[PDB]
Structure formats: structure tokens, C-alpha cells
């Protein structure tokens, strides 16, 4: 389309190193049943652990983006009804503007 | 959960200019590195045929036959075309 564009490929760590310092409980020390409402967090197709109350973890990233601290390209999705946090950086994602 | 819709755009990547070259630059840059060897492995004691890269890149963008020369069609036939100058729009 006209408005459409494409990801170029950002870097993870500045979001990884950002996360584990705002809630994410590393996967090394994870215990299933102990956390059922576990909304395990994903980034560029990797499981870097989980995180409890995500409601905030989300609107924190969103406004982190909307300022320019997280490349406005990068995409992060919250699949509530499945307790999953999808965050992408990948190079090749078609995207419009709204 | 239903099966996974193979045709969901958010799961389709569009390898553009850079990426494509990237690929080339790698596989090529290695044939150079494994040829820089052939100079030392003979030095019983200036060896950089820069042409390799230069020519390679042409060949590719030239035809469109990415994966390279030799005895193989190996590449994806049809990348890199001749811009259309039929109209501005087109």
C-alpha cells in the first residue's frame, strides 16, 4: 500500500536488559503452579521468562515507545486470554501507521 | 485451539534490499577469507583478490541469480529486475 513500510531490524538487549528490571522473573528460576496467572514474556521468538501483573508492564512499554525510547518500529502484543507477551524486533515486518 | 493459519501476514517477512545483499556479502566474504588462507598456507617464508566480492555482487544484481557462480543454478531465479521506465507511476 502507500502508507505501509517495513521493519529494518532493531536490537533486543536494550529491551531485554530493560525488562528483567521491571518485573520479568528469569526462566532459570521458574515454578509452574506457583504462578498460574503466569503471562510468560516473549521477545523475537524467545522465552526470557515470565512476569506477574502485566497490565502495567504493558502500558509502560507502550509509552516507552511513544516517546522514542523503544524504536517505534518494534512491535509488542499482549495476548491476555492466553497469558502471553509477544515482543518483536524482527527485520521484515510490514506495518502501517495510525 | 484451531490449527495455525499459515497465511497470517504478521508471520510473513519481506526480505528487502539490504537483507538480500547481506546474505550475499556473507557467503562471499567467506570465500575471500578461505582464500586469504591459501596465501599463508603456501608462505614457506598483496594476496587479497578483492575482485571476488566486486564481481560477485555484480553477477547477482546483474542477472538475479543470487546464490552465486560455478556449476549450479543454485540461486533463486528472478531477483533484481530492470526498473520499469514506462511511465512515472509505473
Amino acid at each position: 500500500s502507500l502508507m505501509s513500510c517495513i521493519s529494518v531490524g532493531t536490537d533486543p538487549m536494550p529491551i531485554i536488559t530493560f525488562l528483567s528490571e521491571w518485573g520479568m522473573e528469569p526462566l532459570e528460576d521458574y515454578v509452574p503452579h506457583q504462578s498460574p496467572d503466569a503471562t510468560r514474556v516473549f521477545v523475537n521468538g524467545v522465552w526470557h521468562g515470565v512476569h506477574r501483573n502485566p497490565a502495567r508492564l504493558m502500558e509502560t512499554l507502550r509509552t516507552l515507545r511513544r516517546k522514542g525510547d523503544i524504536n517505534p518500529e518494534v512491535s509488542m502484543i499482549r495476548d491476555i486470554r492466553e497469558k502471553e507477551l509477544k515482543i518483536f524486533t524482527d527485520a521484515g515486518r510490514v506495518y502501517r501507521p495510525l | 485451539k484451531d490449527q495455525d493459519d499459515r497465511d497470517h501476514f504478521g508471520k510473513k517477512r519481506l526480505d528487502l534490499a539490504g537483507p538480500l545483499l547481506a546474505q550475499l556479502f556473507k557467503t562471499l566474504f567467506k570465500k575471500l577469507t578461505k582464500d586469504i588462507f591459501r596465501y599463508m598456507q603456501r608462505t614457506v617464508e598483496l594476496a587479497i583478490n578483492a575482485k571476488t566480492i566486486t564481481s560477485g555482487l555484480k553477477y547477482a544484481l546483474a542477472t538475479g541469480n543470487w546464490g552465486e557462480q560455478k556449476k549450479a543454478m543454485s540461486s533463486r531465479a528472478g531477483v533484481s529486475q530492470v526498473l520499469n521506465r514506462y511511465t512515472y507511476s509505473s
Binding site: 531490524g9 | 539490504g18 547481506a22 577469507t33 586469504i36 588462507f37
Partner: peptide, 30 residues
């Protein structure tokens, strides 16, 4: 995409299995 390839990407490729049994530093684009 090209920009990206040139600026960053370009450099990253050169630095990986580069070094031999000789090293490769920065890269210039004239």
C-alpha cells in the same frame, strides 16, 4: 533497508568468523 545494511549490518558481517590462524577492524564506505 540499504542504509541499514551499509551503516550497521555491513560491519557486523565482517566481524564474526573473520580473525584467522590476522584480524579485521572497522570498515570504510567511500
Amino acid at each position: 533497508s540499504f542504509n541499514q545494511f551499509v551503516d550497521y549490518t555491513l560491519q557486523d558481517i565482517i566481524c564474526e568468523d573473520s580473525t584467522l590462524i590476522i584480524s579485521f577492524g572497522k570498515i570504510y564506505v567511500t
